Amino acid sequence: IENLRNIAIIAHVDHGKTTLVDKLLQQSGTFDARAETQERITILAKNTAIKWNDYRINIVDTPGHADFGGEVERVMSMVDSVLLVVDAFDGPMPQTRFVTKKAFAHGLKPIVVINKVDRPGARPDWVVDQVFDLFVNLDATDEQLDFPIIYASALNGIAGLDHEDMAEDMTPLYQAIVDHVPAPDVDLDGPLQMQISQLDYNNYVGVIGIGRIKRGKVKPNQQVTIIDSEGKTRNAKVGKVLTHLGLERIDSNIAEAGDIIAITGLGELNISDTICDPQNVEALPALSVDEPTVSMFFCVNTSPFCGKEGKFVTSRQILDRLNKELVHNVALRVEETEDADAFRVSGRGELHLSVLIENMRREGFELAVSRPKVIFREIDGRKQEPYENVTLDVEEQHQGSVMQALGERKGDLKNMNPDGKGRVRLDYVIPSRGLIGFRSEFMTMTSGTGLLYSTFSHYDDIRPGEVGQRQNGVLISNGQGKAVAFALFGLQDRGKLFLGHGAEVYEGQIIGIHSRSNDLTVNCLTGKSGTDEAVILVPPIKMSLEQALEFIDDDELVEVTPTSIRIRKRHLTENDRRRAN
Ligand code: NA
Numbered sequence: 001i002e003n004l005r006n007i008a009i010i011a012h013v014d015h016g017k018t019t020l021v022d023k024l025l026q027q028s029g030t031f032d033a034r035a036e037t038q039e040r041i042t043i044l045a046k047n048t049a050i051k052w053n054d055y056r057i058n059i060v061d062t063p064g065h066a067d068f069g070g071e072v073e074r075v076m077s078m079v080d081s082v083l084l085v086v087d088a089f090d091g092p093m094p095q096t097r098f099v100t101k102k103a104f105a106h107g108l109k110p111i112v113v114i115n116k117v118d119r120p121g122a123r124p125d126w127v128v129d130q131v132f133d134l135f136v137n138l139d140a141t142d143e144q145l146d147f148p149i150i151y152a153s154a155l156n157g158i159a160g161l162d163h164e165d166m167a168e169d170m171t172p173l174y175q176a177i178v179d180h181v182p183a184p185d186v187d188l189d190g191p192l193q194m195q196i197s198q199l200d201y202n203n204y205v206g207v208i209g210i211g212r213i214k215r216g217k218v219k220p221n222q223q224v225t226i227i228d229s230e231g232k233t234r235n236a237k238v239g240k241v242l243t244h245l246g247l248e249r250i251d252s253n254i255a256e257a258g259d260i261i262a263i264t265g266l267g268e269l270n271i272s273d274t275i276c277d278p279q280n281v282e283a284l285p286a287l288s289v290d291e292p293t294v295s296m297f298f299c300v301n302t303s304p305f306c307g308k309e310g311k312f313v314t315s316r317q318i319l320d321r322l323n324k325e326l327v328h329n330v331a332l333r334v335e336e337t338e339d340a341d342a343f344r345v346s347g348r349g350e351l352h353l354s355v356l357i358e359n360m361r362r363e364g365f366e367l368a369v370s371r372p373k374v375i376f377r378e379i380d381g382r383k384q385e386p387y388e389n390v391t392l393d394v395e396e397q398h399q400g401s402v403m404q405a406l407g408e409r410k411g412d413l414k415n416m417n418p419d420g421k422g423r424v425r426l427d428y429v430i431p432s433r434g435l436i437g438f439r440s441e442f443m444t445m446t447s448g449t450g451l452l453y454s455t456f457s458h459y460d461d462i463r464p465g466e467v468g469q470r471q472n473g474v475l476i477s478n479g480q481g482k483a484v485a486f487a488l489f490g491l492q493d494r495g496k497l498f499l500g501h502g503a504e505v506y507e508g509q510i511i512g513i514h515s516r517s518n519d520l521t522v523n524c525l526t527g528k529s530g531t532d533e534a535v536i537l538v539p540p541i542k543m544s545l546e547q548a549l550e551f552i553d554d555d556e557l558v559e560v561t562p563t564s565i566r567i568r569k570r571h572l573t574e575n576d577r578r579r580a581n
C-alpha cells in the first residue's frame with residue numbers, strides 16, 4: 001500500500017513522453033511483453049505500471065481530446081500527483097495548459113521533467129522560469145509552487161536534479177516520484193468499494209471497467225452489488241480482475257485498495273458506477289461524465305439516386321455498422337426510433353458525428369443525416385438543455401471578436417486570465433446548443449491560432465432564442481434529370497450554385513443558396529433588341545461534409561455517399577413542403 005505511487009503524465013505531443021515512459025520501464029527491469037529495442041503505437045497505454053525496487057508506479061496517460069475534459073478530471077481524481085514533461089528548448093506550450101489547470105484544480109502537487117536537456121540549443125534554466133510563470137498563472141498554492149525538477153535525456157538514459165552534473169542513469173526520476181508523490185490514501189481492511197473511472201472493450205471479454213479501488217479487496221467470481229450515481233442498484237459476479245504490469249494487463253487472483261485495475265464480467269458498467277461488497281452498498285460521489293450533447297438522425301438514403309454510388313445502404317447494414325462503432329467508441333450513443341430506417345446517434349460534439357460519417361462513406365455506405373442539434377430533456381417537470389464549461393485559449397488580438405461571438409451564442413463569461421505573454425484564457429458556461437457550429441467559426445476568427453476546450457457541466461432551464469439562424473433561403477429543383485447551362489446561367493443571377501452543367505438532379509434536391517431569405521422551387525432542366533453574350537457559369541460551391549451539416553436547416557437532409565455530397569428537402573415536392581409550412 002505505502003509502496004504504490006499513482007501519477008498522471010502531461011506532455012505536448014512532440015515532447016517525448018512515450019520515449020520517457022519507455023526508458024523508465026526498461027531501466028526498472030519490469031518484464032516487457034512487446035518487442036521494441038531502440039527507435040530512431042507512438043502513444044502511451046492508458047496505464048503503464050513500473051516496478052522499481054520495492055515500489056510500484058502507475059503512470060496514467062492524460063487524455064488529449066479537447067471535448068473530453070470530463071475524462072481528464074476522472075484521471076486526476078484517481079491519481080495523487082502529476083508528471084508535467086516539458087522540452088528543454090520549447091519550454092511548456094499552451095496545448096497542455098488546459099490539462100495542467102485540471103491537475104492544480106484537483107489540488108495535485110506537480111513533478112516537472114525537463115527532457116531533451118542534451119539536444120542542440122537546450123535552455124533548461126529559461127524553461128524553469130517559463131514553468132514557474134505558468135503555475136503562478138494557474139493560481140498555484142505555495143505547496144504546488146514548491147516542486148521538484150528532474151532534468152532528463154531518454155536518448156542517453158540519464159536524469160538529474162542538476163543538468164550540469166547528471167547521474168549515470170534514471171535513478172533520480174524514480175526517487176523524485178517515490179519521495180514527493182504520496183501513497184494512495186485508502187482503507188485496505190474495509191468492505192470492497194471501487195468506482196468505474198474509464199471504460200474499454202475487447203472481443204475476448206467484452207466491457208472492461210477501469211478504476212482505483214477506494215477500499216477493500218476484489219477477486220475473480222466475487223459477488224458484488226453495483227450502484228450508479230442515480231442510486232439504482234444491481235447484483236453481479238466479477239469475472240476477471242486485471243492488474244497492470246508494464247504495458248500489459250495480468251489475470252490476477254486478487255487486487256487491493258490503492259491499486260488501479262481493470263475488471264470484467266460485470267455487464268454494461270457506466271462511468272461513476274461503484275462496485276460494492278453486497279453488505280455495504282456505498283456509492284462514491286458522481287464523476288464528471290463526457291455526456292453526448294449533440295445528436296443527428298442517421299437515416300437510410302431514400303433519394304431517387306439511392307444505391308447508385310455506394311455498396312452498403314440497407315437499414316440493417318447501417319445499424320450493424322453503428323452498433324459495431326458503439327462498442328469501440330464508448331462516448332457515442334445509438335438509439336432506435338419509431339422509424340426503423342432512422343437511428344438517433346449522439347456524441348461529444350458534431351466533429352464526433354462527422355468523423356463517424358466520413359469513416360462510413362469511405363467503407364462504401366450511403367445515408368441521409370439531419371442537422372446536429374441537442375436533445376431537450378424533461379427533468380423535474382420542465383424542459384432543460386445541456387450546458388457546457390468551455391475554455392478558449394487565444395492570442396490577445398482575438399479576445400474582442402471571440403467574446404462578441406460567444407455572447408451572441410448565449411455564452412456566460414466566468415473568467416478572463418491573460419498570461420502577459422500574448423495569450424488569454426476565457427472560461428464560459430454555454431448551452432451545448434450554442435456551441436454547435438462554433439468550433440469552425442472559432443478557427444477562422446483566430447486564423448487557426450486558438451484552442452477550444454469543452455467539459456459537460458449540467459442540464460438547466462432552456463435559455464431563450466434560437467442560435468445560428470441561417471439568413472439565406474435555398475434553390476430547390478422541381479424536376480429530375482440533367483441540369484443545363486442555360487438554366488444555371490439564369491439562376492446564378494439569383495443566388496450561388498452547388499453544381500454545374502451535366503449534374504444529375506432530382507426533385508427536392510437543393511442546388512443553390514438563394515440571395516433572399518425565402519426558398520424558391522426552380523427549373524434547372526430546360527432553358528427559359530440586345531441580350532447577354534456568353535453562357536459561362538461561375539465555379540460551383542463544393543461543400544465539405546462539415547459545411548453541408550452546418551448549412552442545413554430542420555426541414556433538410558444531407559444525402560451522403562462515398563463519392564458525393566447532396567443537400568435535399570425532407571419533403572421532395574413543393575406540394576408536400578406547402579402542407580407542412
Ligand atoms: Na453511474
Ligand code: NA
Binds near residue numbers: 349435
Ligand atoms: Na458539445
